[PDB]
């Protein structure tokens, strides 16, 4: 594939994120879990329990199979439901709630983000963490102003008719080689997210771009790097990976 380095970079960053906020025996609530790729990662992390939730039944299906045919130590749970736009009560708290490449889908509407943030807060143990990897609105708009919103690997189209402020835009279409097609994404209203979380007892403790994060952790953990071809990136690739940022909140 032409997206291998990108995939490896993203998994690495994700692996480092997990490594940074999870301790042995932790309980993890993976939201928008998808096919459950992070299962192997949580395994190396020695977590005690893993709960996977995704609105797409088709995704949960692959996650189940995955958890079923893998050498794992933690207990596993799965549920196919909307964890952002519909009330959720799994009946227990977690040490770490993870949303990898999907919490932005929680910004469809004002009410939607509210439910989502409230769903994260009621399932998070005091002191627990909410780790995430969301697309950066600042980045996307700046690239917008550069008139360069694509290349071989991806493409982004902002939805804005005549007489419409740029800052007014709340969604765009995203396409990634060997992945989503004209997939609609909602911009992360950072300030609204932060505030909303502050009222629920969660405060921001981290926010860094994928390239710097990639670079930093890379110069501080060369071992896991080599363990997956991680050793550099082209400019085209870096632009895809450059789209995202790491954001962590903590229930204080
Ligand atoms: C990029 N997919 C996650 C991959 C996985 N988290 C990873 O890190 O590899 C995004 C997932 O978001 C999920 N999703 C979208 N909207 C919602 C929602 N409202 N509630 C739960 N999951 C959602 C989709 O079903 C999709 O599987």
Swiss-Prot record:
Localisation per UniProt entry: Nucleus
Stretches assigned to the mRNA cap 0 methyltransferase domain: 1-252
Binding-site residues, S-adenosyl-L-methionine: 14, 32, 54, 82, 100, 105
Outcome recorded upon mutating residue 66 to K: Reduces activity by 96%
EC number: 2.1.1.56
Task of the protein: mRNA-capping methyltransferase that methylates the N7 position of the added guanosine to the 5'-cap structure of mRNAs. Binds RNA containing 5'-terminal GpppC.
Pfam family membership, one: mRNA_G-N7_MeTrfase
Keyword Transmembrane attributed: no
Subunit structure and binding partners: Monomer.
CDD domains: AdoMet_MTases
InterPro entries, A to Z: mRNA_G-N7_MeTrfase_dom, mRNA_G-N7_MeTrfase_euk, RG7MT1, SAM-dependent_MTases_sf
Protein name: mRNA cap guanine-N(7) methyltransferase
GO cellular component terms, semicolon-separated: nucleus
Primary gene name: ABD1
Keywords assigned by UniProt, alphabetized: Methyltransferase, mRNA capping, mRNA processing, Nucleus, RNA-binding, S-adenosyl-L-methionine, Transferase
Effect annotated for changing residue 11 to A: Reduces activity by 85%
Residues binding mRNA, per UniProt: 10-11
PROSITE patterns assigned to the protein according to its UniProt record, in alphabetical order: RNA_CAP0_MT (PS51562)
Result after altering residue 101 to V: Reduces activity by 84%
Site feature location: mRNA cap binding: 35, 41, 66, 104, 185, 244
Class in the EC hierarchy, top level: transferase
Entry superkingdom: Eukaryota
Chemical reaction(s) catalysed: a 5'-end (5'-triphosphoguanosine)-ribonucleoside in mRNA + S-adenosyl-L-methionine = a 5'-end (N(7)-methyl 5'-triphosphoguanosine)-ribonucleoside in mRNA + S-adenosyl-L-homocysteine
